[PDB]
Structures are given as C-alpha cells and as structure tokens.
C-alpha cells in the first residue's frame, strides 16, 4: 500500500499547490507600488562593543531594549549595556562550541546551546551574585541551533537532528517534541504572542508549529538552499526567511505562501540573519558578504547598507522599542546602528 | 556618572578577565579529528592520553593539543564545519583494512572546503598490519579497479597514500601522511612534528614573509 500512500501524498501536494496559486490574485509589489519609498536610510554605528575575541555566532536583545547577550566561540556569553557600552555579565560556558543564545523576556535567564547537543539555562538574578547554570537540557541527538524563551519556565529549542522540542526548564523534560523536518533545523522564531513559532530547516523548508498543540500547521517551501535565519513580522501574521540562496523571502501566514523575494543581481552571499523594524517597514538582512542590507519590506529594494563589518555578520537584532539594530560578525565586533 | 562609576569598574574588571582568558586560551593547539566510522579514531584518541562533540585536551612537549573528535555529530557537516576553521590542522584517520571510497570522498570534501583552503591535514593510515594480512589474502585491486602494479604491501600503501594526497589542490596546504598499526606509541610524535611545521608555516604567512 506504499505506492497508494505515495500517490495520495503527491495528489495532496498538488492540491495544496493549486490552492496556494488560486489564493494569489495580486502580489505584494502591485499593492505597494503607489506608496512613497522610505528613501535612503543612512545608519551610523553609534556604539561598538569590543569584548569578544572569537567569532560571534549569536546575540539577543533584552525586552527592555537596553541589555544584549552575545555568545561567541570564545566560550563566553557577555551581557552588554547598549546605552553605556558596558559589560554587566561574562558567563563562561562549559562548551565553547556555541551556535545560539537567548535572553529571557523577564530578563532573569539566559539560554545557550551549540555542538554539545545541550541547552544550558543560566540564572542571572541569583542570590549568590554569580551566574549559575540552573538547568542543562539534554534531549537532542544533534547540535542545538536555536533556543528561544517562551517565558521563565519553558523554552523552545531547535536542533540539528531535524527536531524542535519544547522544554520545561523547571523539570528539564521535553514537554513536547516537534518533528517533520527532513534536515537540520537551523533557525527558529516565536510569535509575538508566543503561542506558535516557525522554524527554518536546511531542507529549504520552513514549518509553522504551535507549542500548545504540538503539531505543525503549515509548511512554506520556496527557497532553493538551506534556510539560515527566520524572523516574524511584528504583526505576527508574516515572517521572512533568509536562505543560503542569497535571497530572503516574505511569507504570509494567512495567505500560506510567499509575498515578495529580496534579491539583487550583484548579491551572491547567503543570508545569515534576518530581522525586522518595529513597524515592519524595514527588513534588515545579514549577509555573508560582510554587509547588512536594509530592505524596504514593502518595496523590496535596498533602502540602505550597513557597511563596516570585516567578516560575515552572524546575527542581527532590532530592539523591542525599535530604537537600534545590533549586528554581530565573525570579527568579534558587535555594532549598534541607529 | 554617580554610581555608574562602580558599573564601569565592574565592566573593566570583567574586560580584563576576558583578556586574560583569551590569552590563556590562545596557547592551545586546536586539532580537528575526522575519518570514516571505525577508522581507528577511537584507538588513536585513547592512546594519546585522555556524545556529540568529544574534546580530548592533552599536553605534549609543552604544546597543549585540543583535539576535537566530532564524529558523533550525525548530521550535515556543512552547517557546523565552519566553526572549526582557524584550527591548526585536521587529523584524518583512514582504515586500511576496510570503506575506502567513502574516506576518499570525505577527504576530497574536507581538503577543498572553502574554510580549509589553508588548514593542512595530518593524514593517518592505521591498521597497517591488517592491511598487510589482507593483501597476503586478497589483492588490493578490489578497492581500486584501475590499480595496476605489484601486489605487495609497500606498493599498495604507497598507492593509497598517493590517492589520498592527490585530492588537494591549494598550494598553501600540505598533507602529512603516516603509517600506523595501532600497536604503537608513535601516533603522537607524528602529530607533534606536523603541528610544529604547520605552526612555523602559519607564523611565516602571518608575517607576510612566506
């Protein structure tokens, strides 16, 4: 009955493609062709954070738009003060092979993962003064490529063994495991309401999970190579996925397909990080070509360039209040733009 | 700056701690260990003293080798192999007894990798005795259909080494090959001397004199 099941799957895929095509009556560009462009966005490095000595692989902003945790292959996760370029914490990691870091929305905890297959949760507001590992979540068979805090208690982690798992940091057990990816899951972003999240896997597919039910809802397959980054629109009804195909695309959750693709002819390096502005008009994309291009998310043209990085930018994140955008690169430099 | 003078003091304290930690951690010779499954990686890592990534740090003649046996990551290499650049060398183990085409493909993938265009490979050929016994039992033409020549242990080993060392194309890197039987203590001096040569070459390149 395997052949019958394969035929059913193929015809269901054809039906899904037909439905997505029928839902398309006008693209994004034809609707945003009558609005004024944002113009050239001149963005200057206001602060530069020189604390790391190895390639910075991830960074996350505090919910108060002031603190920033930065994780590098140096084996450290320095928590930064963006306004006063100070360092408030320097947490030595057990495993120096770190590929992700998260800052809890309450600010009490900092997660961290990598090639050790284990997400390490750190307690910043400890009575003893120091930062101590409150939990080490060990349930993955592959490198943990992303981890995002739902709240102080539960964290969703994306791993390199084709699985995303929702955890319970109090008891250290997988509350839910999300399966369905056919390759490494190298990116993850939780919705503003944190009731659902998307992941961008390295099989050129991005799936839409919801943590409560624990099952995938929609899959968006538009890319031609591994998806290296993903980020929700602030409305929570869209997200943009940046791939190694040197293109980042805007997907609409309700329309269930692409909206626009952000590519330029002289761009060949693959995306490493995609982030949005507070209003969602600017889509800042990090490139392996040492530059971050600021894309007019509605006009799909380069509104500016964030030049000044001597190596591939590995992470980019806009503050929750939209004041600044911070970029980390492989030259161990974290730069705050505004 | 009223009591932020205490905050700047703390920031400078942990900044000097970061600097000291980086100085201490730059003294270590990082080595990446690859090779096919059951290719003697465990045998050499358990003979040079001391689930996903297994680091075996040890000291030999004042060189702190940090050897990363990353064979436990059964996933796509391309997504995490870029974090292993700036490694001093890539130790490559090959099972001469078993499992040669896969090793050749892996060596071609890793020697022409975009991040390892300068990182030289210390190539190991373990199970020499088993290879010789198998040659005495079975011809070496089984592995290589286009192999023409004498069927002795020395010529077969030389042909295998030539096939492995012909996979590189960057003139800035060299492949150091060795013969091992796994019943030896000479699998560490070879690594040490190859690493010294790589260190002097990288120092000369950094100065621009090379």
């Amino acid at each position, epitope marked *: 009955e395997l052949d019958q099941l394969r035929q059913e799957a193929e015809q269901l895929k054809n039906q899904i493609r037909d439905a997505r095509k029928a839902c398309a009556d006008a693209t994004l560009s034809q609707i945003t062709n009558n609005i004024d462009p944002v113009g050239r966005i001149q963005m200057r490095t206001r602060r530069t954070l020189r604390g790391h000595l190895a390639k910075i692989y991830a960074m996350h902003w505090g919910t108060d738009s002031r603190l920033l945790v930065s994780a590098s292959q140096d084996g450290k996760l320095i928590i930064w003060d963006s306004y006063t370029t100070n360092k408030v914490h320097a947490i030595p990691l057990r495993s120096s092979w770190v590929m992700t870091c998260a800052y809890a929305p309450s*600010g009490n905890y900092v997660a961290c993962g990598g090639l050790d297959n284990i997400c390490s949760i750190y307690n910043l*507001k400890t009575r003893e*003064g120091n930062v101590r590992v409150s939990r080490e979540l060990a349930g993955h068979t592959g490198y943990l490529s992303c981890c995002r805090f739902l709240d102080d208690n539960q964290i969703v982690t994306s791993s390199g063994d084709t699985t995303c798992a929702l955890w319970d940091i109090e008891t250290g057990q997988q509350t839910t495991t999300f399966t369905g990816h056919t390759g490494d899951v190298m990116s993850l972003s939780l919705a503003p309401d944190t009731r659902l999240f998307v992941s961008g896997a390295c099989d050129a597919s991005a799936k839409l999970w919801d943590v409560r039910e624990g099952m995938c809802r929609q899959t968006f397959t538009g890319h031609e190579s591994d998806i290296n980054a993903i980020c929700f629109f602030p409305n929570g009804n869209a997200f943009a996925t940046g791939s190694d195909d040197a293109t980042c695309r805007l997907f609409d959750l309700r329309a269930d397909q692409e909206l626009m693709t952000y590519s330029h002819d002289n761009i060949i390096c693959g995306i490493t990080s995609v982030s949005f502005s507070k209003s969602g008009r600017l889509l800042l994309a990090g490139y392996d070509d040492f530059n971050c291009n600021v894309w007019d998310a509605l006009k799909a043209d380069r509104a500016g360039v964030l030049a000044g990085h001597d190596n591939r930018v590995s992470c980019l994140g806009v503050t929750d209040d939209g004041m600044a955008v911070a970029t980390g690169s492989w030259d161990s430099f974290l730069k705050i733009w505004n | 700056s*009223a*009591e932020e003078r205490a*905050a700047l*003091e*703390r920031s400078k304290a942990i900044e000097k701690n970061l600097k000291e930690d980086g100085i201490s951690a730059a003294k270590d010779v990082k080595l990446l260990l690859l090779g096919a499954d059951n290719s003697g990686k465990s045998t050499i890592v358990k003979q040079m003293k001391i689930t996903g990534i297994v680091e075996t740090h040890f000291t030999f003649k004042n060189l702190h080798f940090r050897l990363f046996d990353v064979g436990g990551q059964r996933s796509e290499r391309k997504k995490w192999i870029h974090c292993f650049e700036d490694v001093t060398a890539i130790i490559f183990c090959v099972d001469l007894s078993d499992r040669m085409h896969e090793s050749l493909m892996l060596f071609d993938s890793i020697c022409n990798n975009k991040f390892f265009i300068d990182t030289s490979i210390i190539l190991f050929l373990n199970k020499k005795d088993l290879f010789g016994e198998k040659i005495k039992k079975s011809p070496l033409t089984i592995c290589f259909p286009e192999y023409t020549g004498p069927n002795t242990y020395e010529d077969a080993a030389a042909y295998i080494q030539a096939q492995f060392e012909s996979k590189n194309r960057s003139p800035n890197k060299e492949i150091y090959c060795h013969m091992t039987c796994a019943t030896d203590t000479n699998n560490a001096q070879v690594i040490f001397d190859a690493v010294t040569d790589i260190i002097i070459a990288n120092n000369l390149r950094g100065c621009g004199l090379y």
Partner: single-chain antibody
Framework: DVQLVESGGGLVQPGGSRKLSCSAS????????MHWVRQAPEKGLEWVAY????????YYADTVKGRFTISRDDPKNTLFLQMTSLRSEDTAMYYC??????????????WGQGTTLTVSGSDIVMTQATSSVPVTPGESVSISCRSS???????????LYWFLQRPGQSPQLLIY???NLASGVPDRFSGSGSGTAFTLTISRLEAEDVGVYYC?????????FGAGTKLEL
C-alpha cells in the same frame, strides 16, 4: 544560605584601636562591593566606609577618613575595618553590607548582623520631617524624606534607598533607587518621589512591618542617611 557574620566588637578604651572582621559565606564575595554602616545606640544609621569589587575604590566619611580603613580578603571571604584613635563618639553597632553594582543590580540588599562597639559642607542633607508615627495594623502609612539636592540624575535614575530596621534586627533593603522593590520584600511596600521630596507608602501595614524606616541616597560618597521614622503599634 547567604550569611554575613562579623565579630570583633567590645569594650574599647578611648584612644585605642580595634579591628572588625566580616566573615562572609553563601555568596560570591569576590564580585561584591562591601560597605560598613554603623548605628549609634540612640541615633540612626551613618555610612562609614566602602570597598569595591577588586579593592579598587575606597571611600570614607568626613569623620572616618584617616582614622579608619576598609580592607577585604577575597580568598578568605572576609572584610576588615581597622579603626585608629577611637574617640568616645565612635560607639555604634557596625553592620556589614554587600552592594554589588551593575545595571539593574540591588545594592545594599543584604546586611550583616553587627558588632556593638561600646567605647568608653557640600554633602546631601536628607532629613525626615517626622521622627515617629502611631499606626495600627490594617492601616496605610506614608513616610517622607526630603533631600537638599536633586537626586534625579541626568540618566533618569534617582538614587534614593529605603531601609527597614525591625526591633533587635538588622536593616533590610526595601526600595532601591526610590521606586524598585527589593527581592523578598512584600508587594505592599511602595516608593515614589520627584527629585528632592521622596515618600514611601505602605498599604495594609502588618505587625511585622513595625520598626524604624531609613532613607538613603547613593548619588555621591559620602552617603547620608535619614533621621529614621519609627512606626510603632
């Protein structure tokens, strides 16, 4: 748990010397800037000295400079306050206070127990108008404390602290930076103010909340305590 036990206090003849040691355990003493706060038998608190993390910066009061010295022993987890030429006005009960400083930190959060020591112009003048209030459980009480200078710094943070010294106990930080409630303090305690005039409001006052409330600024060393408003049952 976190424990700051100090000893070395007793009857000292005038003109003598005495060393106080503050044994610390349960926390990372190395990264904490440690203070010394004294309290005369009939007066309020009065800041004495301060040694920062890493023994970098040391401060003293006007009546302390030269006479005292503050040292710490990070490997031994002990803080020393060597005193020289102890006058008759140096009698007090010297407390040990840990005040780690970073963005969002909670300075003065834990206080030692104290050792009684029975000895035989540009500063911020912070005065509390009322020195005692009669209150009843279940009622709301507000304590005020006016400052000479504006404590609202240009960075948006006003540096006013509120401490409660229950009878027979050590002060416990209640409100730090004039609006933030310290960890472990019940939510019924609230603080407010504007630049110079500050007030702390307590809702549903309980029998365990009776004591003497002190107001403190941290804008500049030396640090001036309030007279101390005492609320009795």
């Amino acid at each position: 748990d976190v424990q700051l036990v100090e000893s070395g206090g007793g009857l000292v003849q005038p003109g003598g010397s005495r060393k106080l040691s503050c044994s610390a355990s349960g926390f990372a003493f190395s990264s904490f800037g440690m203070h010394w706060v004294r309290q005369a038998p009939e007066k309020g608190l009065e800041w004495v000295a301060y040694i920062s993390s890493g023994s970098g910066t040391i401060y003293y009061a006007d009546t302390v400079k030269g006479r005292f010295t503050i040292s710490r022993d990070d490997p031994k987890n002990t803080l020393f306050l060597q005193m020289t030429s102890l006058r008759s006005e140096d009698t007090a009960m010297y407390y040990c206070v840990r005040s780690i400083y970073y963005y969002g930190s909670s300075p003065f959060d834990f206080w030692g127990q104290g050792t009684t020591l029975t000895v035989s112009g540009s500063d911020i003048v912070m005065t509390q108008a009322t020195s005692s209030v009669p209150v009843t459980p279940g009622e709301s009480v507000s304590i005020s404390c006016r400052s000479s200078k504006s404590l609202l710094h240009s960075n948006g943070n006003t540096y006013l602290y509120w401490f409660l010294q229950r009878p027979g106990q050590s002060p416990q930080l209640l409100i730090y930076r004039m609006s933030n409630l310290a960890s472990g303090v019940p939510d019924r305690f609230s603080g407010s103010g504007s630049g110079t005039a500050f007030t702390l409001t307590i809702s549903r006052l309980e029998a365990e909340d009776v004591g003497v409330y002190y107001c403190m600024q941290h804008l500049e060393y030396p640090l001036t305590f309030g007279a101390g408003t005492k609320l009795e049952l």
